[PDB]
Amino acid sequence: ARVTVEDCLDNVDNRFELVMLATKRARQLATGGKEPKVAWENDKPTVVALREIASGLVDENVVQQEDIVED
């Protein structure tokens, strides 16, 4: 379970930066080998990236910090 699109969009309330924030995080979980903070519940990286937005684990500065350590 844990599929909430309104809970993740309740904090930002833009519905446009959420798609941009989840895009930069979905590629890290698919390419590069980044381990997600939430558990793998047999979900695709596109949906499991939205769980970290609703739970507040990742943010705008969290994705930028995790990608800068790899470069």
């Binding site: 519905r15 798609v19 895009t23 979900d43 939205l50």
Partner: protein, 1338 residues
């Protein structure tokens, strides 16, 4: 990676740079071998190679040879795809003039040389001579020479004379154009003239000179000496079946030019005379002209073919150009289509997809999953596994579609909800299983309709389908605030039968300890579905902020209403399910559930209502039979009585008592009365027929009838359809527009006759043929609305303005048809509202009014509110987020980047397919307050009104206006001001037949010049029925007395002169024709004397003509300045409507026609916003005389009146959004600072007023005035030329943008679509924002 796509004229030095070689021979290929010949239209040396990495000879055919070019017969080794990019050029021996810059609406060559279009066409055809550098000769450069006049020029002058003829002369006239000198001559000769016939000619010629100076385009480039050659792959010569070849219409055109160019080059070296060489150069003109464009003065070649030809310009114009064909459609991959099918077991976020379609749509995703899992080594082996349909492939397909959404769209996409995303599941069959609840937004029935599918590939598009385009996200309508996903007729039927209280049923009066005991008693068959019981319920209340407190109470409800409360979320009370659950009651519950518990608990609640409605509608086997259409037993007593009342009239028609028209209105109004009498007697017998027995009785309850339940619950059917099944059908219409005398007295249960059935076919095919126009006219309206409001998008978060329009409820009539509850819901306040007290405000500042603030304003007596609107916003190139509001599919306000201009045009064009005074009396009881009505109290106790700009209002005890009535001039007022009115009694009386008059002061007044022989005539009725001074017509007057007019002179009783205050001239008013004088000569009343009595389209085309701001067929006449108006001369042919301003010294005289019957009189002062003559008024003069606040009120309320009549409802933000783009251009009244007399945009006029004010200039005398443009003229004002070439003419917008060097940017929506870039609206705003801060900054 590119920006600012610029366009300009092509120089001969740049045309040679695009080309890779010159073509010299006109052939294409060899007859024996199919190889491109050298120096031809198809040549592998100039263009690219034919085969991949291989020349024509074959010396180099490998990858290691790229820059090596063979010398014997080979070509440059390339990828064989450069044949689309390589170009050629033909160096013409004689110059040719471009027809695009010659044959258009403006003469680009004529205005540049001060020459006529016909005269230039005369020199280009070698018929007349022109003079170059006349100088000291006897003729002017504008004077032409003939064949006999040119020979004389070389005899008298000899020296200082040079004359040419043909295209070389036009090329020479543009060499010495003196661009830096001609502008200096036009600047010193423009202010000398004063006639407007020469201002528009010299200014239009001046603006073209500065265009050729700053852009860099030289006037010499308008005529070309070398033309480019289209690449060969764009004009393909491909073979067909059977050895037949097929070429394009440009190869024979390119061959015809080369055939004539080489013939002219050979005719020059043979020393041929001028008689033969002037005709060959003339043929080369129309040879290149027919290649560029067709349809001009040069007729295109037509050989062995019906259609004339397809030239170069015909490929980008003519409703079939390559630029316009792609804007209306483009085939895509990863798509498919199939019929739709209802699936009642699916969730709201998922749909059914066949296995045969999922294998083809997700084919690339399976090939990548088979290699990653280890089932296939290569992609060639993985493809063969799908063709065999191996069992292990189904396990892979089930994993690639688990979280991958797909897009479904119906063919007619009228609004935004036409495309929604679903999670596909694998189903067995060939039909797409659709959810029953999403069928209302799609407007899709199960009659064989098809639905297209699409697969988003990138994860950027997959996140947009889940977060934006999901079916669970767009649960509310984008046009209103009401839910669009509501239970349809089949679900609302099961919820209505379940919650339907009965009088006596099984298990009535028993008590239940909880809701689980109710289901346990119903499933055992020991309790009816609807019986009066008492059940203890534990509910939770969300009314407290952050406190979900539970309450346990004992309620008195039925069994079915208790089972329905099991699916209701915890935040809602029980009083929401104690009703009968009609369709209008369920939609209001889903809307209330969305604002309390949110969205997650609502998408799972709308699915429970569909499961509960489908379950309890099947248990009750409702069915329609022949006995369900009950017929009232009193229908025969009304039809037989109405038939006898017409027989007594037909006898009077044969006796001569009534006429044909008098009998028509008698029998039409008679059957209309009997039709309503049967309808009210049918619904009374249909609704209260079910009888029951309670401990012994005959009690009447609501009818448990199948035909009554389907109409009461709102599932399907209305009062107009049940009327034709049980009651009489009534009177039928006619395509001519009249009503037939004989009605249809039979219904569909009893059956119709042969003549009664043929009559009903008139209105049947009239409504069916009307639907063909409803899809052609409304589709043309929603397309014009998008072309205007496409660039409008939310860009700024806060504008910082305080301007706004006032919002008041519609109090027209008896009650408010649309109160302030829904007119202010979702709009930010502009100014702080004040209580009747002092220093007490309701709202603190500009705040978003939600459902919690609507009730806070209903408790108070606040009636007016100043809200923000897009038509009053100050954000340049966009619209503010705070000025829009929160009326959308979301609960919060609009976000930055939302294209609010496209959702506004789709909200108006979607419901377009559904579109086609003697006395006043106060209805309710309250105080009477009059505003802007200056009255004079008489001696009897009555009031007389002299102005018409005001109206009468009914003040409620709280302090709110709920009734507004309009009063004509001279309307006698019965009640006073500040008293309690009587509900049902009159308050004022009027006279719509004869316009009354008013007197300023009392005195012995007598008619001057009334000899009763020429001017007036003493008329007497029968038995002294008329004893007054009756006026006569102007046509009946004599020829000598026609100049003199009867006038009344007001004099006081003492003999002194009486003059009205504020006006020098006394109150001397002339009596018009057809007037009666009640007061005698020398005796009148104290006040209120009527000296003279003056006697007296809808639907879809109405909304279309209202957005265009068209002038009606009979425009109304309004006043300009507030002053005393007067008449002029009537025997001349017109009417001089002179008026003297009483407050200011500025007389303004205007003329008026005589066929338009005026309603104003002589000697009455009129205001600025007062209407003189009756009739519809165009929205143009209402903007100038009143302003923009009155225009936004008249346009919105007039468009809503067309939509509110049909039942649909659209928010006011969508009409004010389109109105913002129409009120965009401005016009200057005075000249001196602008270029021409016309106006420019208000965004450019405002940015120039701030630099001129806080600069070298002190004042800003360059003022302006607001103008209104239609949805057709406002769309033409587009700074871009890429997007302007779509809906406008292509060949007209390309010649204008070329001569000015218009560098077009891509800061819009329509430009980035055909180019291929991201759109600035939506998620693409982050791409255009990250580039602006890195281009103009660091």
């Amino acid at each position: 990676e590119f920006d600012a796509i610029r366009i300009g004229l092509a120089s001969p030095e740049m045309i040679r740079s695009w080309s890779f070689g010159e073509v010299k021979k006109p052939e294409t290929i060899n007859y024996r071998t199919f190889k491109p010949e050298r120096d031809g239209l198809f040549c592998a040396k100039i263009f690219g190679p034919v085969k991949d990495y291989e020349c024509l000879c074959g010396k180099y055919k490998r990858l290691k040879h790229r820059g090596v070019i063979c010398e014997k017969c080979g070509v440059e080794v390339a990828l064989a795809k450069v044949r689309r990019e390589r170009m050629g050029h033909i160096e013409l021996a004689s110059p040719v003039a471009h027809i695009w810059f010659l044959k258009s609406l403006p003469s680009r060559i004529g205005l540049l040389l001060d020459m006529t279009l016909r005269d230039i066409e005369r020199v280009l055809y070698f018929e007349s001579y022109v003079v170059i550098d006349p100088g000291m000769t006897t003729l002017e450069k504008g004077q032409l020479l003939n064949d006999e006049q040119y020979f004389e020029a070389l005899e008298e002058f000899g020296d200082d004379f040079d004359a040419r003829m043909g295209a070389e002369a036009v090329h020479e006239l543009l060499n010495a154009i003196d661009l830096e000198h001609e502008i200096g001559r036009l600047r010193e000769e423009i202010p000398q003239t004063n006639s407007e016939t020469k201002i528009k000619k010299l200014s239009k010629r001046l603006k073209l000179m500065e265009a050729f100076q700053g852009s860099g385009n030289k006037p010499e480039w308008m005529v070309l000496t070398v033309l480019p050659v289209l690449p060969p792959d764009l004009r393909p010569l491909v073979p067909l079946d059977g050895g037949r070849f097929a070429t394009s219409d440009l190869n024979d055109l390119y061959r015809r030019v080369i055939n004539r160019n080489n013939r002219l080059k050979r005719l020059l070296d043979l020393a041929a005379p001028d008689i033969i060489v002037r005709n060959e150069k003339r043929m080369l003109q129309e040879a290149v002209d027919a290649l560029l464009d067709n349809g001009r003065r040069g007729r295109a070649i037509t050989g062995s073919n019906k259609r004339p030809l397809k030239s170069l310009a015909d490929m980008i114009k003519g409703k079939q150009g390559r630029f316009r064909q792609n804007l209306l459609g483009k085939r895509v991959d990863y798509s498919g289509r199939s019929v739709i099918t209802v699936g009642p077991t699916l969730r709201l976020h998922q749909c059914g997809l066949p296995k045969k379609m999922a294998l083809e749509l997700f084919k690339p995703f399976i090939f990548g999953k088979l290699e990653g899992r280890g089932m296939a080594t290569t992609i060639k082996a993985a493809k063969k596994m799908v063709e065999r349909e191996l069992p292990e492939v189904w396990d892979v397909l089930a994993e690639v579609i688990r979280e991958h959404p797909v897009l479904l769209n119906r063919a007619p996409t009228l609004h935004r909800l036409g495309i929604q995303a679903f999670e596909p599941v694998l189903i067995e069959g060939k039909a797409i299983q659709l959810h029953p609840l999403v069928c209302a937004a799609y407007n899709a029935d199960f009659d064989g309709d098809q639905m297209a599918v699409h697969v988003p590939l990138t994860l950027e598009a997959q996140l947009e389908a889940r977060a934006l385009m999901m079916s669970t996200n767009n649960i509310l309508s984008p046009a209103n605030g009401e839910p669009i996903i509501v239970p349809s007729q089949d679900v609302v039927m099961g919820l209505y039968y379940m919650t339907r209280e009965a009088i006596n049923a099984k298990g009535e009066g028993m008590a239940f300890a909880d809701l689980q005991e109710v289901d346990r008693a119903y499933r055992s068959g020991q309790a009816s579905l609807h019986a009066r019981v008492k059940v203890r319920i534990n509910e939770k209340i969300k009314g407290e902020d952050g406190q979900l407190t539970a309450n346990t109470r004992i309620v008195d409800t039925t069994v079915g209403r208790a089972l329905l409360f099991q699916v209701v979320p915890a935040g809602l009370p029980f009083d929401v399910v104690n009703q009968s659950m009609k369709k209008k009651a369920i939609s209001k519950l889903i809307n209330h559930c969305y604002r309390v518990v949110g969205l997650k608990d609502t998408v799972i609640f709308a699915d429970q209502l569909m499961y509960t409605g489908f379950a309890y509608s099947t248990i009750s086997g409702v069915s329609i039979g022949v006995n369900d259409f009950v017929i009232p037993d009193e229908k025969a007593r009304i039809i037989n009585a109405a038939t006898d009342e017409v027989k007594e009239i037909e006898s009077q028609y044969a006796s001569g008592l009534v006429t044909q028209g008098e009998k028509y209105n008698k029998v039409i109004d008679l059957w209309s009365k009997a039709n309503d009498e049967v309808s009210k007697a049918m619904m009374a017998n249909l609704s209260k027929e079910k009888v029951v027995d309670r401990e012994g009785k005959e009690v009447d309850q609501e009818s448990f009838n199948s035909m009554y339940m389907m109409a009461d619950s709102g599932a399907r059917g209305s009062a107009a359809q049940i009327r034709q099944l049980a009651g009489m059908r009534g009177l039928m219409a006619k395509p001519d527009g009249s009503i037939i005398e004989t009605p249809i007295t039979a219904n569909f249960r009893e059956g119709l006759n042969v003549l009664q059935y043929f009559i009903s076919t008139h209105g049947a095919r009239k409504g069916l043929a009307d639907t063909a126009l409803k899809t052609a006219n409304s589709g043309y309206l929603t397309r014009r609305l998008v072309d205007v409001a496409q660039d409008l998008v939310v860009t700024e978060i806060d504008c910082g303005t305080e301007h706004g329009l006032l919002m008041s409820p519609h109090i027209e009539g008896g009650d408010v048809v649309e109160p302030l509850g829904e007119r202010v819901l979702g709009r930010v306040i502009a100014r702080d509202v004040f209580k009747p007290g002092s220093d007490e405000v309701i709202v603190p500042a500009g705040t978003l009014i939600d459902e919690k603030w609507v009730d806070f304003l209903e408790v108070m007596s606040v009636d007016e509110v100043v809200v923000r609107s897009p038509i009053t916003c100050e954000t340049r190139h966009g619209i503010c987020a705070m000025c829009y509001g929160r009326d959308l599919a979301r609960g919060h306000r609009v976000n930055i980047g939302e294209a609010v201009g496209v959702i506004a045009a789709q909200s108006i064009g979607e419901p377009g397919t559904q579109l086609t005074a003697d006395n006043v009396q106060v209805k309710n009881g309250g105080t009477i307050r009059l505003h802007n009505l200056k009255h004079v109290v008489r001696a009897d106790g009555a009031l007389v009104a002299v102005s018409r700009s005001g109206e009468l209002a009914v003040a409620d005890d709280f302090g709110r206006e709920r009734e507004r009535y309009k009063l004509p001039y001279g309307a006698v007022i019965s009640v006073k001001e500040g008293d309690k009115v009587d509900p049902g009694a009159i308050v004022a009386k009027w006279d719509p037949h004869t316009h009354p008059i008013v007197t300023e002061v009392d005195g012995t007044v007598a008619f001057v010049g009334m000899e009763e022989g020429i001017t007036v005539k003493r008329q007497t009725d029968e038995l002294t029925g008329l004893t007054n001074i009756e006026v006569m017509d102007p046509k009946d007057r004599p020829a000598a007395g026609k100049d003199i007019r009867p006038a009344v002179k007001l004099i006081d009783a003492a003999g002194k002169d009486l003059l009205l205050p504020g006006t020098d001239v006394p109150a001397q008013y002339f009596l018009p024709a057809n007037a009666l004088v009640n007061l005698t000569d020398g005796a009148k009343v104290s006040i209120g004397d009527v000296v003279a009595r003056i006697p007296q389209t809808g639907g879809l085309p109405r909304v279309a003509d209202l957005f265009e701001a068209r002038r009606p067929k009979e425009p109304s006449i309004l006043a300009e300045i507030s002053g005393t108006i007067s008449f002029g001369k009537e025997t001349k042919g017109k009417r001089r409507l002179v008026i003297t301003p009483n407050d200011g010294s500025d007389p303004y005289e205007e003329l008026i026609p005589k066929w338009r019957h005026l309603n104003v009189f002589e000697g009455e002062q009129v205001n600025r916003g007062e209407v003189i003559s009756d009739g519809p008024s165009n929205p143009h003069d209402i903007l100038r005389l009143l302003g923009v606040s009155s225009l936004a009120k008249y346009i919105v309320n007039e468009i809503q009146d067309v939509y509110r009549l049909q039942g649909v409802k659209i928010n006011d933000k969508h009409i004010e959004t389109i109105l913002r783009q129409m009120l965009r251009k401005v016009e200057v009244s005075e000249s001196g600072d602008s270029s021409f007399i016309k106006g420019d945009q208000v965004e450019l006029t405002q940015v120039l007023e701030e630099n001129e004010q806080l600069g070298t200039e002190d004042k800003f005398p360059a003022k302006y005035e607001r103008v209104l443009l239609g949805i057709t003229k406002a769309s033409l004002s587009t700074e871009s030329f890429i997007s302007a070439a779509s809906f406008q003419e292509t060949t007209r917008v390309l010649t204008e943008a070329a001569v000015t060097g218009k560098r077009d940017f891509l800061r819009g929506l329509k430009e980035n679509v055909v180019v291929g870039r991201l759109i600035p609206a939506g998620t693409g705003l982050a791409y255009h924002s990250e580039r602006k801060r890195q281009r103009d900054l660091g």
